[PDB]
Amino acid sequence: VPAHEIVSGAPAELSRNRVVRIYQQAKPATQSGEYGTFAWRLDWDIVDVANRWENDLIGWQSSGDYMQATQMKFTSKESAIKFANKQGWDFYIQEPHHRKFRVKQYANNFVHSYGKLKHIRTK
Amino acid sequence: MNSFENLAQDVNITRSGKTLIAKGTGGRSSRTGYTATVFGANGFLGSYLTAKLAKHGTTVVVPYREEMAKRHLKVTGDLGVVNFLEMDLRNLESIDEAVRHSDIVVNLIGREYETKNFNYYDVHVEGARRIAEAVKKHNIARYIHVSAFNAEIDSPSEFNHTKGLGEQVTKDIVPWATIVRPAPMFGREDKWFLDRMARSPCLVSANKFQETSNPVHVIDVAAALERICFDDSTVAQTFELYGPQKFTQKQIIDMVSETLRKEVRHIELPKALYQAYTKATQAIWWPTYSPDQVERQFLSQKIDPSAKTFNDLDLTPMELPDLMFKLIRPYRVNVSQLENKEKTFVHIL
Amino acid sequence: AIIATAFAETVKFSGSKQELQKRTLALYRQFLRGAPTFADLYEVQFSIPTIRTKIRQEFERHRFVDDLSIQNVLYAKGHMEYQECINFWKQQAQFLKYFPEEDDIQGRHQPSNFVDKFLKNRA
Amino acid sequence: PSWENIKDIRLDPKVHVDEVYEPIVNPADRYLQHVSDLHQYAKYIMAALPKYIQGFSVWKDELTLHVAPSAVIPVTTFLRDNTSTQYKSIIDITAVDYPSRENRFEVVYNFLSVRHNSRIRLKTYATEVTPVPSITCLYEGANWFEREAYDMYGVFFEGHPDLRRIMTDYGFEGHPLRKDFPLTGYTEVRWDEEKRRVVYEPLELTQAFRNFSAGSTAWEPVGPGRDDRPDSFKLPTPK
Amino acid sequence: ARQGSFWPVTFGLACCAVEMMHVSAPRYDQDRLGIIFRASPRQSDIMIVAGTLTNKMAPVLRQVYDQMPEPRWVISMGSCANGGGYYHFSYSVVRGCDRIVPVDVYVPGCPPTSEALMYGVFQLQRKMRNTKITRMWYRK
Amino acid sequence: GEHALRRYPSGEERCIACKLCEAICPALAITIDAEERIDGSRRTTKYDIDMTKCIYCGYCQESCPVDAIVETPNVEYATETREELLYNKEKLLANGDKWELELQYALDADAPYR
Amino acid sequence: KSIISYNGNTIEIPEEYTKQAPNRDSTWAPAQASKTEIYKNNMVRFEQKDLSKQPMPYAGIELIAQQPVRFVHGNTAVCDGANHNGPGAQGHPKIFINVDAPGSHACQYCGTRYEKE
Amino acid sequence: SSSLYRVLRNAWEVGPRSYWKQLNSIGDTKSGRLVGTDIYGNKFYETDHQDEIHLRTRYVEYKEKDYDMSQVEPGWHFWLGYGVDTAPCNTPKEKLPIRAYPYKFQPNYTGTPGAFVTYNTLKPKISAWEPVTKQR
Amino acid sequence: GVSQDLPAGLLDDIYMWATQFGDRLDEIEELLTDNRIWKLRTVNIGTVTAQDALNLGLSGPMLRGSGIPFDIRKNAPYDAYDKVDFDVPVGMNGDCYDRYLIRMAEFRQSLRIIEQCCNDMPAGAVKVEDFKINSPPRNLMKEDMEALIHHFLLYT
Amino acid sequence: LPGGPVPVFKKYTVGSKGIWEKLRVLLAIAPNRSTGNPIVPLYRVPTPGSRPEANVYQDPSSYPTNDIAENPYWKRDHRRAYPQTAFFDQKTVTGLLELGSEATPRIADGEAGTKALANIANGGVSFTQALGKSSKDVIYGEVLTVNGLPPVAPTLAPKQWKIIEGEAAIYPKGYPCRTFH
Ligand SMILES: NC(=O)C1=CN([C@@H]2O[C@H](COP(=O)(O)OP(=O)(O)OC[C@H]3O[C@@H](n4cnc5c(N)ncnc54)[C@H](OP(=O)(O)O)[C@@H]3O)[C@@H](O)[C@H]2O)C=CC1
Ligand code: SF4
Numbered sequence A: 001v002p003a004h005e006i007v008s009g010a011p012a013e014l015s016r017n018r019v020v021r022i023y024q025q026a027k028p029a030t031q032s033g034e035y036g037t038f039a040w041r042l043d044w045d046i047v048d049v050a051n052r053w054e055n056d057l058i059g060w061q062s063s064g065d066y067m068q069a070t071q072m073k074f075t076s077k078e079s080a081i082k083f084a085n086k087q088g089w090d091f092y093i094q095e096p097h098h099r100k101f102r103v104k105q106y107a108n109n110f111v112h113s114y115g116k117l118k119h120i121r122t123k
Numbered sequence B: 001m002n003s004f005e006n007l008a009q010d011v012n013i014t015r016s017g018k019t020l021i022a023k024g025t026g027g028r029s030s031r032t033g034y035t036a037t038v039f040g041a042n043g044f045l046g047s048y049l050t051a052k053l054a055k056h057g058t059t060v061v062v063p064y065r066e067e068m069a070k071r072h073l074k075v076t077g078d079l080g081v082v083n084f085l086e087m088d089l090r091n092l093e094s095i096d097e098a099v100r101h102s103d104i105v106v107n108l109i110g111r112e113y114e115t116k117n118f119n120y121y122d123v124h125v126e127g128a129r130r131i132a133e134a135v136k137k138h139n140i141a142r143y144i145h146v147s148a149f150n151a152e153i154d155s156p157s158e159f160n161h162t163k164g165l166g167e168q169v170t171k172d173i174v175p176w177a178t179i180v181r182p183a184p185m186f187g188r189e190d191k192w193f194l195d196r197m198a199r200s201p202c203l204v205s206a207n208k209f210q211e212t213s214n215p216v217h218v219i220d221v222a223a224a225l226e227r228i229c230f231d232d233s234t235v236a237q238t239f240e241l242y243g244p245q246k247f248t249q250k251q252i253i254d255m256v257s258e259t260l261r262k263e264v265r266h267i268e269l270p271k272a273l274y275q276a277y278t279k280a281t282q283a284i285w286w287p288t289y290s291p292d293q294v295e296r297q298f299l300s301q302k303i304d305p306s307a308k309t310f311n312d313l314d315l316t317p318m319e320l321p322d323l324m325f326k327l328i329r330p331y332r333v334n335v336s337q338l339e340n341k342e343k344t345f346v347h348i349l
Numbered sequence C: 001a002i003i004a005t006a007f008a009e010t011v012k013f014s015g016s017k018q019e020l021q022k023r024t025l026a027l028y029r030q031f032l033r034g035a036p037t038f039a040d041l042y043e044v045q046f047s048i049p050t051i052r053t054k055i056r057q058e059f060e061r062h063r064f065v066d067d068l069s070i071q072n073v074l075y076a077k078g079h080m081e082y083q084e085c086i087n088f089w090k091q092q093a094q095f096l097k098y099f100p101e102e103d104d105i106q107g108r109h110q111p112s113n114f115v116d117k118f119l120k121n122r123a
Numbered sequence D: 001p002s003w004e005n006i007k008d009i010r011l012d013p014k015v016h017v018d019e020v021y022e023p024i025v026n027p028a029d030r031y032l033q034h035v036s037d038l039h040q041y042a043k044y045i046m047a048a049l050p051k052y053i054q055g056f057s058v059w060k061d062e063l064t065l066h067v068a069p070s071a072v073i074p075v076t077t078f079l080r081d082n083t084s085t086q087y088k089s090i091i092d093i094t095a096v097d098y099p100s101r102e103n104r105f106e107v108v109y110n111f112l113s114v115r116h117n118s119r120i121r122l123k124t125y126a127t128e129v130t131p132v133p134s135i136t137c138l139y140e141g142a143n144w145f146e147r148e149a150y151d152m153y154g155v156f157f158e159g160h161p162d163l164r165r166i167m168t169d170y171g172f173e174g175h176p177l178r179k180d181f182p183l184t185g186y187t188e189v190r191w192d193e194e195k196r197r198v199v200y201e202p203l204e205l206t207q208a209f210r211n212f213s214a215g216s217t218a219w220e221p222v223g224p225g226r227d228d229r230p231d232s233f234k235l236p237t238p239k
Numbered sequence E: 001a002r003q004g005s006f007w008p009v010t011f012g013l014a015c016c017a018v019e020m021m022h023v024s025a026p027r028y029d030q031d032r033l034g035i036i037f038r039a040s041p042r043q044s045d046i047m048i049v050a051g052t053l054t055n056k057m058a059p060v061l062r063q064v065y066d067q068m069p070e071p072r073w074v075i076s077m078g079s080c081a082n083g084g085g086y087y088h089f090s091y092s093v094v095r096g097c098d099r100i101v102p103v104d105v106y107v108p109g110c111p112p113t114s115e116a117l118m119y120g121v122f123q124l125q126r127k128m129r130n131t132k133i134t135r136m137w138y139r140k
Numbered sequence F: 001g002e003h004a005l006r007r008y009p010s011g012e013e014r015c016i017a018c019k020l021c022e023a024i025c026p027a028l029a030i031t032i033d034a035e036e037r038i039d040g041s042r043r044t045t046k047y048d049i050d051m052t053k054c055i056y057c058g059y060c061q062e063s064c065p066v067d068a069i070v071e072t073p074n075v076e077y078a079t080e081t082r083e084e085l086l087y088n089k090e091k092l093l094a095n096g097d098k099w100e101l102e103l104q105y106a107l108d109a110d111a112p113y114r
Numbered sequence G: 001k002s003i004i005s006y007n008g009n010t011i012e013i014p015e016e017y018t019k020q021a022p023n024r025d026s027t028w029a030p031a032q033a034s035k036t037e038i039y040k041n042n043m044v045r046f047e048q049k050d051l052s053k054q055p056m057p058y059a060g061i062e063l064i065a066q067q068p069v070r071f072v073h074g075n076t077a078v079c080d081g082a083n084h085n086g087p088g089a090q091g092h093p094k095i096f097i098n099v100d101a102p103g104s105h106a107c108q109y110c111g112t113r114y115e116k117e
Numbered sequence H: 001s002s003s004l005y006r007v008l009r010n011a012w013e014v015g016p017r018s019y020w021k022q023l024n025s026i027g028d029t030k031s032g033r034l035v036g037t038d039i040y041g042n043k044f045y046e047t048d049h050q051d052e053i054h055l056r057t058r059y060v061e062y063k064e065k066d067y068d069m070s071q072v073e074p075g076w077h078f079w080l081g082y083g084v085d086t087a088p089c090n091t092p093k094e095k096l097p098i099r100a101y102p103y104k105f106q107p108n109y110t111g112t113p114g115a116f117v118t119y120n121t122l123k124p125k126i127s128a129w130e131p132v133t134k135q136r
Numbered sequence I: 001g002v003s004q005d006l007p008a009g010l011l012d013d014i015y016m017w018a019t020q021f022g023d024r025l026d027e028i029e030e031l032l033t034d035n036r037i038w039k040l041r042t043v044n045i046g047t048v049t050a051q052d053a054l055n056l057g058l059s060g061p062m063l064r065g066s067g068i069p070f071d072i073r074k075n076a077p078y079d080a081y082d083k084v085d086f087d088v089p090v091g092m093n094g095d096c097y098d099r100y101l102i103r104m105a106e107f108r109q110s111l112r113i114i115e116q117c118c119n120d121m122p123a124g125a126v127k128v129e130d131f132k133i134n135s136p137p138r139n140l141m142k143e144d145m146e147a148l149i150h151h152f153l154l155y156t
Numbered sequence J: 001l002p003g004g005p006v007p008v009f010k011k012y013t014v015g016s017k018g019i020w021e022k023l024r025v026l027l028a029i030a031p032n033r034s035t036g037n038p039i040v041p042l043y044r045v046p047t048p049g050s051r052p053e054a055n056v057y058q059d060p061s062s063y064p065t066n067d068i069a070e071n072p073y074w075k076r077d078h079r080r081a082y083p084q085t086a087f088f089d090q091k092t093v094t095g096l097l098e099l100g101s102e103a104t105p106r107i108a109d110g111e112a113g114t115k116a117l118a119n120i121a122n123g124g125v126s127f128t129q130a131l132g133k134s135s136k137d138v139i140y141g142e143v144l145t146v147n148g149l150p151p152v153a154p155t156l157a158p159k160q161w162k163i164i165e166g167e168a169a170i171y172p173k174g175y176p177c178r179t180f181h
């Protein structure tokens, strides 16, 4: 694997002190769309002291960490791993979680209960 | 990334009881937590001091005397850091008012020539008495008072007499004041040491220059002063801040003349005629060489051995010969192989 | 832009390592001859051998680089930095980017062990 | 014949419609015949240089030839020299990085034949360190463009006099228009009072950048859409 | 005397420089105030940072400000010249000339209206009313 | 020109904290924190504009559905410090107080064309 | 009057400037930051400054409580917030308020309380 | 126009005392008709005369020796800049906005000690623990 | 499309300006075009041959300084420049003087555009038809649930 | 000749009056020149903040789009009817040279025609072999023009220039700038 961290112009401290994360964005629990859940994001774990702090003056969120806003999108998982170790970065990778396929019928809603009903549907 | 070099830690508590959590990494947009009042911050030492002080985000409170100088301090701190407020030494409400919120406070109010408004007794011991009485009233941690080298009450020079008197009065009022006594101070556009030798029509004196004093760079004095400002070991201690090696004036002027590559003038006329000449030039508005600065041409560097040097606060001062070249650069003025090589170029087209 | 700048070189990529070694050799010679010009030109405080040892140290950074292609981009960047420094296009404030630690001691309390790094949580 | 006796414009009968009628039509429909002509032209260009043209794409009166980097110089000369093409003027050349591809940057060339009133695009590829050859021997005006595509992207142009940075800082370490480089960057500038010069420091903001891209749509906002391909240049269905 | 003759150096470099050339225009005249662009900092009383300040120009802006004779002021025209402006989160920009030069009057507006630039000039001349150069030496 | 937070007839702050002026501002000058107040009504706790990074595009005025923030035609407010040029909620409510007679004249002639 | 500025030092401001507004003494939000906390936090820069030329613009939570309560005969009470001297679309979007519960229901845009009668 | 006859006839119409006041005020000599006066106190004038260029018709005579553009009232500021035809004396009460509070008019106080200071409108984001000890 | 509609009485105003601008630009033409100083200072300065103007990527008044008849608003027309009649000035020698003379006549052609578009201005909508790419009017979005949804989404 | 000199009483400018007009017809270069200042009662009255037209203004629209009931939006959206990039490999052009086209298909036996397509789809033949196997009529029909000439670089709307020479030109003879129409 070629090592491009010395020719990108990035500092040494970014490659040796910062750990990064590849992740597929989770499907939001609020809305039922799934469009932002395909591209693999690259995002940096925060620094304890350097993230954010409230300004004395007004209450502005001031930062010392500069990679906090950068976030990348990749097509595949392999492309993200290849780029991340090509730039010389320490990464953790988080595996996605899909829903289990369970067969649904509408006619399940009112099947005949021989014993105790143990439920009242309402619709 | 940047780092809080001046602080030992993140969380610092004052002696008064205030708790100060420093925020963020080092640098311009961060804040350390301290509130500091630097008196005389338009001066020569004070500009470097509040440069270093507002560099990391300590809130600097600047009581100013004139509105036009103080502009050059507003660039050195972040937005909201340096706070200018007007002050006369005569109105006690303004001295009362400037130190009211300060976690630390330093004065450097010291004037070398007598004025029509202030003698030496007015600025050096009575102004220090007013400031120190305010600091005693408000219970301010870490009052530090800068005074001159060779500052004793028995001395015949009025300057040194009332500096020693100012030290005694600020010891009487506040017991916990650090008192700091620096050597002659060379810096960039300094007062009377190197800026005077680089441009002077005559360079006249007494003594045949044989007084002995060593000079200290001013970023070294400001660095040592800020390194005092933040540790609580330096409470109620007197500090001598003197450079690495002892000089005489003719030695310094030979050192300046060998880097200028120009012969600076020398006169050495007698003392009484010189004294009467300075007496004559006192009646003019721009600041002239003082007549009690004639008496300080005889007094040499008398160091107290019962004091603490650069060695305590972990600093090594830079020597004058290594740094003479940089400060004297603008006043600097400026065979056959060339003529064998210039017989191939074109000069008339 | 028919004619080129004075100390320019048409960028050209060598397929052998020994030709690249010859070119970096010639380039160290070109930096090293021009260090009195830099000390005169940028009005620096210190002496010429500190510039010369900065030039040596910046080649000491990239000695054990294996990839010829990365050695090639590194050579081209170094010749561009030479062409900026010798023509006086860079100024003294960007020339002294190269010397951040010489110009002033940043202050007391340098954290070396875990404890001094911990008390300021890395600052 | 005086300036007080001049008539005023503000009181006069002005035109008044009760209702305006504007027919609705797809603006992609006006292109379709020229888009077919562009298809036939590009098929010829591929049949003329089969060694050097990997593909082409016609969007909507926009032609793009898809060419290898070692194949840059032989195609461009053709686009200059053939009388049917005559793409004399260089317009703009630049790069685009897709970090998901192995060859990260693609380099696009735009040409304009002012004879035939036609535009053309030429796309090649290049990784961060491997080059693409320069067309500045052909074109006197290309080199500044090439050199701009240097400084923002780090793409190399082998055979280029005066390749160095343009329109960034002189001591600038990095290549800005690149997806790993952050927005605000690495350094900042202030006037140090002590050193009596500007100093370059690591970055620190008084307000952090808040991007609002987090919070885009979760529904696929556009469809697949139709096609402008003519019936001549798609593969026949059997039977 | 410091008001009725009032000489800025024409540092203006971008969007806000044309808006300064409307202060030179015949509708909002500056000659009628005493304003003229001596285009050398050795003779200008004041400077106008009228436009952006990138990181490549911050030493150049200071070297132009360093030269002007000692009664000197500076007004900061535009929103790109105080606090970065539209380009605040950019890699090659100085977040206002407050970092470089000590500024006295801020004129806000992204193209700060020629009305508003002239109003900033009148505000600077009011600051020159109460400078008290000779009362200060009496130590008021 | 400068900014103003208007008020309803019979004095109510008009800013329902919908964050639409913040989301559209091309130079990120707006910052808002919002909390439900004692009445249960949605209001801004903190409203703020940095006038040193405002670019005067008027999108913040075009975007507000209640029409709570507007642009007064005042350009004569040039200051001497930066701290003065940072406008919190109180400075902008005092502007929308002061210019309300004038903003009547502006929005009587603009509001059909908006 | 006298509030402690983090050091035991009492600072003294007039009583007309500790109010949130001259309508209302106290705070109308759980993070409203009462004025005494504000002068306690940064009094370093209220030095040498007039307090009266600070804005202090009439808190609106009290100017809406003194407006009368509208009474509607029907079930639904409909609201604009518009003026009807103004030539255009001013005010807030039209919302329709159910007035059935005991009490008076407020408009969520304008705060005008409506009650069924 | 720039003629001497115009300044001469306006000096005759306005009168010598107000001529001297307008000459210390502006360079021009202007004769207007008193449209109205300001709540701060600033008389405004509008010019009938035939030889007047565009944007010359309306003007202010101030009250103070130290004058600002910020000292004119908001509804009048839009009229002096030729935004509205009808002055705020002659507008109906329908176009007067209804208020529930009094009006103040602070002009501008830059350099004056009554300059604006900014602060946090809200309290710090994360609270700390107020300590109570416990006897075990 | 466009932000919003014209103000109520601007079209009668752009005419009143054009009638005098036609003379205000004849006057600037008098002390430059036939100045012998302005001529001599700009005669063979900046000469661009027509084959070098293309390799350099030059366009507009500098390509039309040098002989080649090309401009986009005639060659590949857009935004209703086909419906509006005008001519184009194109120099013959590549100097700075023919780059000067073709600027002086594009004033003329632009004033011709302004007159022909003041006369032929139609009525109708000024923004595009639909509210999925630009916002509804504020009359409509305060009444319409659909248009409030579209307004709130085109800005967030 | 339509845009020629018109006298200065059709120009909306403050001009001159009385004996001073007779003075300046003598002392002038061209008498039909305005002085530059707009007429005060004409130019910008009433001011834009006080217009009677703003009270009556209403949002414009065209008829097949403001229609309340006849259109559905999916018939008249064109953002979602965008066309795609027609991306053509080298191998699909071999398909178009050997299989044929949908306009003129050279394919019989469609069930075997899918298998005849499939080896090209896998890379059976090459593009140079496709050009060599192709008949002269195919090469002159679809690759070349029907006369045998290369296709001209296409333009959307061709422009035919017409130089205006006489008194309708913008500069008379002797000036080095010509008008081209
Ligand atoms: N060789 C040297 O420099 C030596 C100096 N020191 C002492 O260091 C301190 C500062 O040294 P340095 O920087 O060189 O000289 P300074 O220029 O700083 O001395 C004057 C400073 O104090 C202010 N000052 C003087 N008088 C008053 C007064 N009545 N009221 C208020 N402020 C006043 C001045 O205000 P303004 O800025 O307006 O002028 C100025 O800030 C002094 O105490 C000095 O005694 C110690 C030994 C030797
Ligand atoms: S302040 Fe505004 S107009 Fe001026 S240069 Fe910057 S962005 Fe352009």
Ligand code: SF4
Binding pocket: F014, F015, F016, F017, F018, F019, F020, F021, F022, F032, F063, F064, F065, F066, F067, F068, F069
């Ligand atoms: S001012 Fe308008 S857009 Fe901004 S928060 Fe208030 S209602 Fe929303």
Ligand code: SF4
Binding pocket: F021, F024, F025, F026, F027, F028, F029, F030, F049, F053, F054, F055, F056, F057, F058, F059, F060, F061
């Ligand atoms: S005018 Fe523009 S930049 Fe300013 S606050 Fe409004 S939207 Fe933001």
Ligand SMILES: [Zn+2]
Binding pocket: G079, G080, G081, G092, G107, G108, G109, G110, G111, G112
């Ligand atoms: Zn409502």
